[PDB]
Structure formats: C-alpha cells, structure tokens
C-alpha cells in the first residue's frame, strides 16, 4: 500500500507457497529477563493506579470547590436578606 | 493437535472451546477463553468440486483457532493493559477480522477462502492474568 | 458444556439459570446470576426448512448464554464499579442487545 | 539494563501525562474558581449597596 507486505510466499524450486504465518507464544528464554520485565508490569500497573486516583482527587477537589462556591453564594444571599431586615430594625432603632 | 478423530465433519452453526495465552505491550501474562461462533458457507451445495474443497484442510478447528489466536495476540501486543482491560471486547473482536464499517467498528464475519469456513462471533468470558502478583497488585487498585 | 441430553427441545417461554463471573475497569471480581427469559419465534410453522433451521444449533442454551455473557462482560469492563453498583440493571440490559429506543 | 531504561522511558511518559492531566484539571478548576468568585461578588454588589 513504507507499507504493509503481501500475504504469499512462493518457492519457485517446487511450487510450495506459504500463505499465512501465525504466532502465539512470544516467550523470552532467559529467566532473569522475564523476572525484570515482571517488574516493568508491576510498576506500570501502579502508575496507572496513581493516574486514576489522581483523576479521582481532581474530581473531588472540583466538587469541593463548586459546592463551596455555591455555599458562599447562598451565604451572600442570606447575609443580604438578613441585612435587608436589619434595615427596618436599625431605622426604627 | 490431534485429539478427536471422526468422519462426520460438522459444518452447522457451532463453536470452539478455545483458550489462549497472550501478551501486550506492558507484559502481564494473560489467559483468555474464546468461543468462535462458526459455520460453513457453501453457496453451491450441488457443486462436487466446491463440496470437495471443504475437506482440503485436515484440521479446520486447529487452523481457524490458531489464525484467530495470532490475530488476537499480535494486536494486543500493541496495546497497554489498562486500555486493554478497559476496551478489550472491542479491540479483540475488531482485530481478528474485517475493517471499518461505520476510525470505526469492524465487521462481524471472518471468512476462510481455503475451505468455506466462516466465524461469525467471538465470545469471551474469562479475562484472567496469569501471574499471581499481578492480580495481587491490582487487588490493591480496587481496594 | 454437556449436562442435559433430551430429544424434546423446549421452545416455549422459559428461562436460563445462568451465573457469570465478570470484571469491570476497576477490577473487583464479581459474580452475577442471569435469568434469560427466552422463547422461539417461528413465523411460518408449516415451513419444513424454517422448522428444520431450529436444530441447526447443537447447544442453543450454551450459545445464547455465552453470547449474552460476552455482551455483559465486555461492556461492564468499560464502566467503574461504583457507577456499576449504581446503574447496573440498566447498563447490563442495554449492552446485551439492541440500541437506543 | 536496556530493558530497564525503556521501563524508565515509559514511566517517564506516564509521569508526563499525569502532570499534564494535573495541570489541565487544576487550570480548569481555577477557571471555575474565577467564575464562582465573580458570581458571588456579583451578588455581593446588592448586599453591599443596600448595606
């Protein structure tokens, strides 16, 4: 299509052709190689655990701040209304 | 490789009780079971040559399962596990056959021109990591 | 895989006593039971070919249960558990078949 | 050693992604902070004129 290869392997000596080559077991031979790359997975799983918990903390602080801001909103409303009647209280005082 | 030997080659809608060990880019050894909903498409039943093309394979189940196995494992080897455990059923069923249909979702049909075998659906039920310590660590993730 | 063997293939309204192990994006191993209210739609009963298409499957219960099992587990694997334990009955029944209504 | 160096590379990429998400979520959170403060002091107007 640089690009993908064909799906046919002809042998002109006899007429043999190989259409597909399937693989199922990529396995390193050395034990210590697999031991070390076990560490790679055991750390790369934990880093994404950190990522998802960081996203959760971000969401938690977002909810905290938005609820807190709405609560100052209703605080401002309540103070303004209380001092609306603090008017009549203080003029007739 | 050679367990069941019978003259009655089943061609109706059936399945394959297959399990595969795979690896993806982050190396956590994982074992998955596959269903391989399959059946045979013979568009001209009366045709002797086309009917005889059915038995051109000696192990139809073996060839189909190993081919879909390679298509699974090669594609998973190009994905990280957390994306995989997120979006497995999609990527595993799109990488085994077909191309975009709607980039986009794949088809729902896997034809084998050698014999007429087709795989319609690939069902999975057991995504299980092989290593014990992997599952121990991701138990911490949930906890 | 092969427990009950009988010639009388039931096609009336019945169910499947099925239980499944599933995993979702946050990995808490969970086991759920399914009912699978099922029946057979044969729009032309007198049709011999269409009536014979009924036994094209050797394990109708097995195929149906495993297919719905894959549809459950693949979709749950894309949801977090607290959203799942919140909205399970909805997502599990919408992901197994159909589209928006 | 050359396997471990690429483990360091992928975990460094993951940390970069994590700090990117941290900073973008933090910036959007200052965004909504600014919106909330501006709105609260919008009503702090009426509060303070009639005070």
- Two tokens, residue C42: 């044969």
CB neighbour class for B135 (10 Å; exposed up to 12, middle 13-18, buried from 19): middle
Nearest by CB to D11, which of A47, A58, A87? A47
**Rounded Cα distance, B42 and B53, in Å:** 10
Per CB distance under 8 Å, which residues of A are interface residues toward D? 33, 36-37, 39-40, 43-44, 47-48, 50-51, 54-55, 58, 61-62, 65-66, 68-70, 72-73, 76-77, 79-80, 83-84, 87
**How many of the other CB atoms lie within 10 Å of CB of A39?**
13
Q: Spell out the residues 6+ positions from residue B26 whose beta carbon is closer than 8 angstroms to its own.
A: A40, A41, A44, A45, B80, B81, D10
Write down how long chain A is.
93
- Two tokens, residue C39: 């029946």
Rg of the Cα atoms in chain D: 22
Are B3 and B18 spatial neighbours (Cβ–Cβ below 8 Å)?
Answer: no
Q: Spell out the residues 6+ positions from residue D39 whose beta carbon is closer than 8 angstroms to its own.
A: A69, A73
Experimental technique for the deposited model: cryo-EM
- Two tokens, residue D47: 């509060």
Locate tokens 């191993």: which residue?
Answer: C29
Locate tokens 């693989």: which residue?
Answer: A23
**Rounded Cα distance, B60 and B118, in Å:** 11
What are the strands, taking DSSP E only, across chain C?
A: 18-22, 30-34
**Rounded Cα distance, B73 and B96, in Å:** 9
**Rounded Cα distance, C99 and B87, in Å:** 19
What are the strands, taking DSSP E only, across B1-141?
A: 18-22, 30-34, 37-40, 110-111, 117-121, 127-129
Nearest by CB to C77, which of B35, B89, B141? B89
- Two tokens, residue B72: 């699974």
* B48 CA: distance to closest CA in chain C (Å): 23
> Could you tell me which of D39, B52, A41, B35 has the C-alpha nearest to residue C71?
B35
**CA distance from start to end of chain C:** 35
**CB spacing of C58 vs B141 below 8 angstroms:** no
**Rounded Cα distance, B2 and B59, in Å:** 8
Nearest by CB to A23, which of B70, B137, B140? B70
- At residue A88, the 3 state secondary structure works out as helix
- Report how far Cα B135 is from the mean position of its chain's Cα atoms: 24
Residue C3 backbone phi and psi in degrees, to 5: -115, -55
**Chain A residues 33-92 with CB within 8 Å of chain B:** 37-38, 40-42, 44-46, 48-49, 52
Locate tokens 């034809």: which residue?
Answer: B111
- Two tokens, residue B74: 């090669």
- Report how far Cα A25 is from the mean position of its chain's Cα atoms: 30
* B109 CA: distance to closest CA in chain A (Å): 19
> Could you tell me which of C7, C9, C32, C6 has the C-alpha nearest to residue C21?
C32
């Amino acid at each position: 299509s640089l690009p993908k290869a064909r799906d046919q392997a002809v042998f002109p000596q006899n007429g043999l052709v190989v259409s597909s080559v399937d693989v199922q077991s990529v396995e390193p031979v050395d034990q210590r190689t697999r031991d070390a790359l076990q560490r790679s997975v055991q750390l790369a799983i934990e880093i994404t655990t950190n990522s998802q918990e960081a996203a959760a903390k971000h969401e938690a602080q977002r909810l905290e701040q938005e609820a807190r801001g709405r609560l100052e909103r209703q605080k401002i409303l309540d103070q303004s209304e209380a001092e609306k009647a603090r008017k009549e209280l203080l003029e007739l005082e | 490789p050679h367990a069941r030997r019978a003259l009655c080659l089943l061609l109706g809608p059936d399945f394959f009780t297959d399990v595969i060990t795979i690896e993806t880019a982050d190396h956590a050894r994982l074992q998955l079971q596959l269903a391989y909903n399959w059946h045979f498409e013979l568009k001209n039943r009366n045709d002797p040559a086309e009917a005889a093309k059915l038995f051109s394979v000696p192990d139809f189940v073996g060839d189909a399962c190993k081919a879909i196995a390679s298509r699974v494992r090669g594609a998973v080897a190009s994905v990280t596990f957390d994306d995989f455990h997120k979006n497995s059923a999609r990527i595993i069923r799109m990488a085994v056959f077909g191309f975009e249909m709607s980039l986009p979702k794949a088809r729902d049909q896997a034809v084998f021109p050698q014999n007429g075998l087709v795989v319609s659906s690939v069902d999975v039920q057991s995504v299980e990591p092989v290593d014990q310590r992997t599952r121990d660590a991701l138990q911490r993730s949930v906890q």
